[PDB]
Amino acid sequence: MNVAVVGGGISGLAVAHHLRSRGTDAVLLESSARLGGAVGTHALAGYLVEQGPNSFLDREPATRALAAALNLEGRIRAADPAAKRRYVYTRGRLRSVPASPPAFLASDILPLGARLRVAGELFSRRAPEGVDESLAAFGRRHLGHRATQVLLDAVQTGIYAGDVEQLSVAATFPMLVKMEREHRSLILGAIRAQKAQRQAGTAPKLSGALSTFDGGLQVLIDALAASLGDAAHVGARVEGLAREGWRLIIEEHGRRAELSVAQVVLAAPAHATAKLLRPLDDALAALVAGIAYAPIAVVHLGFDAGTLPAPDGFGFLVPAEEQRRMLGAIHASTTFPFRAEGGRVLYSCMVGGARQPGLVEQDEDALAALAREELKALAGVTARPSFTRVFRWPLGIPQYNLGHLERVAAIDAALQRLPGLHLIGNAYKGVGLNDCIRNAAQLADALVA
């Protein structure tokens, strides 16, 4: 009858909520003093600043179903007035990322032969057979070297803070690999997909717009916390589990307690879930423990109204070949004007990632100085900030590197030999908010069986 959920980030919260909304009592245990995990918005100095995540793409049904179940649909906010441009630092300046194929062919984002080579994606050679090919290898084959170096590397940085040479395209971009399987060429697949839809409606159509909530993504967290209420325990570290069924040893209020449930859902990060799995299956815990994370810091810089202009666009990204100490920045106030009061301008700068993890081990003063130097060199920002807030995440973002899918497949096969045990979270089948929520609901539905 009962389920324990371990971990209270978006995945754990969404699993417990979906179980309870279908009449399965779930208890959730969070080791921290607060729910949310990576998600957290802070009201400071006239800003709403985001701990980690800033937005979701309003294209996932599960996230809309969850907002509806939580009476949040009217609190969903779209991606700013202007602010539809993306920039990439390449060849000495911030350069606008073209949004259409005709704008791309006329653009200076890449040299002429390299743009012509992107059009030659029509003639892409077959994928290597039976090979878990990298993102960078995938790009060279489809796009050319220049487009991969600067453009695909940028896209990858904004989502995973990873290494383009190490990421599995099949794990990181399932839909690109599927289109490749069906159509070889991505351009061909798109032409054909447009033909298909243009040949022949109850619920409203999802815009795919870059979205958040009126008070940040904290609104979603506060709402899950209020929905679960007593069923979700804060400052409850799980330090053991074993068969009996399933018994959890919990450390709440500085003391030991025990809990007995029919089924356990582990929604903690790979390193923490591996620690719990070790006494049950050493080989399984090693698989789980082998999932790499990339460290990441966010440096928020607030500016008094008038001291600099409002930066155009959602933000910018910087390719690894540029050999810079910053990954990119939002443009938080341009994108979402409600997250800053009285004309104040907020940048949220991202530092670290897979290729420079050591920068995240620096102190906040040094990270703020780094962000200011880089923002000067790349964006031309000379003004002095009146606000500074640094968050460091050095358990960082899961890296779906070569061999990831076969790892997760072997993680799944080991879980079958352990009835009533289940994994969920950003480590396995999707890093983003939307993936976590969709995967969370899908597990919850399958448990009521």
Which of these segments, 134-142, 308-316, 338-346, 382-390, binds ligand ACJ (CB under 6 A)? 308-316
Q: Which is nearer to ligand ACJ, 187 or 327 (CB)?
A: 327
> Is the separation of the CB atoms in 312 and 321 below 8 Å?
no
Paired with 94 in beta bridges are 89
Paired with 179 in beta bridges are none
H runs (alpha helix) in 317-362 = 332-335
Regarding 398 and contact with ligand ACJ (CB under 6 A), the answer is no
C-alpha–C-alpha distance, residues 282 and 278, integer Å? 5
C-alpha–C-alpha distance, residues 320 and 135, integer Å? 14
Q: How many CA atoms lie within 13 A of 214 on its CB side?
A: 7
Minimum CB distance to ligand FAD, residue 160 (Å): 9
Which of ligand FAD, ligand ACJ, none is residue 426 near (CB under 5 to 8 Å by kind)?
A: ligand FAD
Binders of ligand ACJ in range 161-190 (CB under 6 A): 161
Which of these segments, 28-36, 88-96, 145-153, 372-380, binds ligand FAD (CB under 6 A)? 28-36
Minimum CB distance to ligand FAD, residue 158 (Å): 9
Q: Annotation-wise, does 52 bind a ligand?
A: yes
> Is the separation of the CB atoms in 135 and 159 below 8 Å?
no
Minimum CB distance to ligand ACJ, residue 28 (Å): 24
Regarding 160 and contact with ligand ACJ (CB under 6 A), the answer is yes
Nearest CA to 166 among 176, 175, 174, 157? 157
Regarding 265 and contact with ligand FAD (CB under 6 A), the answer is no
Regarding 27 and contact with ligand ACJ (CB under 6 A), the answer is no
C-alpha–C-alpha distance, residues 61 and 202, integer Å? 13
- Which pairs from 201-205 meet CB under 8 Å and 24+ separation? none
Minimum CB distance to ligand FAD, residue 168 (Å): 17
> Is the separation of the CB atoms in 360 and 344 below 8 Å?
no
CA distances from 439 to 30, 256, 429, 430, 432 (A): 19, 32, 8, 8, 11
Regarding 39 and contact with ligand FAD (CB under 6 A), the answer is yes
Mapped onto helix, strand or coil, the DSSP state of residue 13 is helix
Provide the CA 442 distance to its chain's centre, in angstroms: 19
Total of chain residues touching ligand ACJ, rule CB under 6 A? 17
Minimum CB distance to ligand ACJ, residue 193 (Å): 23
Regarding 320 and contact with ligand ACJ (CB under 6 A), the answer is no
Regarding 157 and contact with ligand ACJ (CB under 6 A), the answer is yes
Regarding 86 and contact with ligand ACJ (CB under 6 A), the answer is yes
Minimum CB distance to ligand FAD, residue 374 (Å): 17
Which positions touch ligand ACJ (CB under 6 A)? 86, 157-161, 296, 314-317, 327-330, 350, 397
Residues annotated within the binding site for FAD are 7-12, 30-31, 38, 52-55, 238, 393, 431-433
